Amino acid sequence: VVKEIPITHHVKEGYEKADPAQFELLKVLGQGSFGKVFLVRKKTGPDAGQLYAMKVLKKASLKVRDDILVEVNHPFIVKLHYAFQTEGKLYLILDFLRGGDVFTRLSKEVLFTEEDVKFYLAELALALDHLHQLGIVYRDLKPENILLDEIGHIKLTDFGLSKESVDQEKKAYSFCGTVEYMAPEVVNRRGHSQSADWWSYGVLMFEMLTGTLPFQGKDRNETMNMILKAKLGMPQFLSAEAQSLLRMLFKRNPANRLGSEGVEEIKRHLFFANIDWDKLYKREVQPPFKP
Ligand SMILES: Nc1ncnc2c1ncn2[C@@H]1O[C@H](COP(=O)(O)OP(=O)(O)NP(=O)(O)O)[C@@H](O)[C@H]1O
Ligand SMILES: Nc1ncnc2c1ncn2[C@@H]1O[C@H](COP(=O)(O)OP(=O)(O)NP(=O)(O)O)[C@@H](O)[C@H]1O
Ligand SMILES: [Zn+2]
């Protein structure tokens, strides 16, 4: 059964409860759909002087089928250090990633190869599956949630939090995820799923390997109709293995889709035959680009 766990308090093991005065603002790091991400310096305590990313929201819960803010820990997912409530606001204190998003870094190259993209898709795959084993769904995978750390390893900026903006105008017109990355059944309002994450994952693969989105129209409605019904040519410049992974991810019906039976069939796919998943998880594999 899908249970919604409200997020109101969090302290990482070994530390003490935080409040807004313990953090000083340095400079904004970016803006999402749920607000702004600020760079902050911890003022006092054991971790005084340490830098963190900070998110300001209204409310934030976590839906889980069937500790949880500690279980979501993973080599390729951002760590939440603190969460607290004050004056109608929820503050999230996070790991501050210094590398920027993957798309920016890729745009800084004239060209790149399937192998580079393969590094990113592999780490990402491990992150997704990790959340799915905990009964969590990422829901809204997008390029803006995929950052680089200092070394050039992947970090997701979230782990499926159901969030609510504090800006009253932005909260007013908020609904679901980013349509360009939605699986057909999500578009058809049948609900988010692990399988839908793997569709999103496929769309990110296509976009990374072609520089283009597979379905986009002149507006919301047209984009949706394309997702459901439009044609999609196979990029002929891709290897047979890449063509095969793409072909197996892009099934409009879930449980027909690769990954809807775990990530093992994804890890075993000919496209990742090159990858030592144990070394990958241990961050012993060398990133294609330094940030
Ligand atoms: N921990 C972090 N460290 C550094 N930069 C971050 C961090 N989290 C977010 N950002 C930046 O801030 C922007 C917002 O990221 P995101 O976490 O997606 O915001 P959001 O509103 O929570 N979700 P979305 O609505 O999908 O944007 C991104 O473009 C990131 O580059
Ligand atoms: N962890 C999960 N496991 C399985 N199904 C989930 C999970 N989380 C959400 N769902 C499904 O996604 C739906 C939640 O979306 P709902 O609140 O009905 O409107 P929504 O706007 O699509 N949600 P959101 O995208 O978070 O704003 C439910 O009907 C669930 O079946
Ligand atoms: Zn939704």
Question: Brief overview, please?
Answer:
Keywords: ATP-binding, Cytoplasm, Kinase, Magnesium, Metal-binding, Nucleotide-binding, Nucleus, Phosphoprotein, Repeat, Serine/threonine-protein kinase, Transferase. It comes from Homo sapiens (Human). The chain is 29% helix and 20% strand.
Report on the architecture of this protein:
- This protein is an alpha+beta fold.
- It has a domain at 100-282: Transferase(Phosphotransferase), domain 1 (Orthogonal Bundle), CATH 1.10.510.
- It is built from ten helices and eleven strands.
- It has helices spanning 68-71, 102-107, 114-133, 168-172, 184-187, 194-210, 220-229, 240-249, 264-267, 277-281; strands at residues 2-6, 10-11, 23-31, 36-42, 51-57, 59-65, 80-86, 89-94, 146-148, 154-156, 162-164.
- The chain has a six-stranded antiparallel beta sheet, with no helix packed on it. Strands 1-6-11 form a three-stranded antiparallel beta sheet, with no helix packed on it. The protein has a two-stranded antiparallel sheet with strand order 9-10.
- A hairpin with a 4-residue loop joins strand 3 (23-31) and strand 4.
- Helix 3 packs antiparallel against helix 6.
- The protein is globular and about 55 Å long.
- The chain binds phosphoaminophosphonic acid-adenylate ester (ANP) (2 copies) and zinc ion (ZN).
- The modification Phosphoserine is found at residue 174.
- This is Ribosomal protein S6 kinase alpha-6.
- Forms a complex with MAPK3/ERK1 but not with MAPK9 or MAPK14 in serum-starved cells.
- The active site is at residue 140.
- Residues 23-272 form the Protein kinase domain.
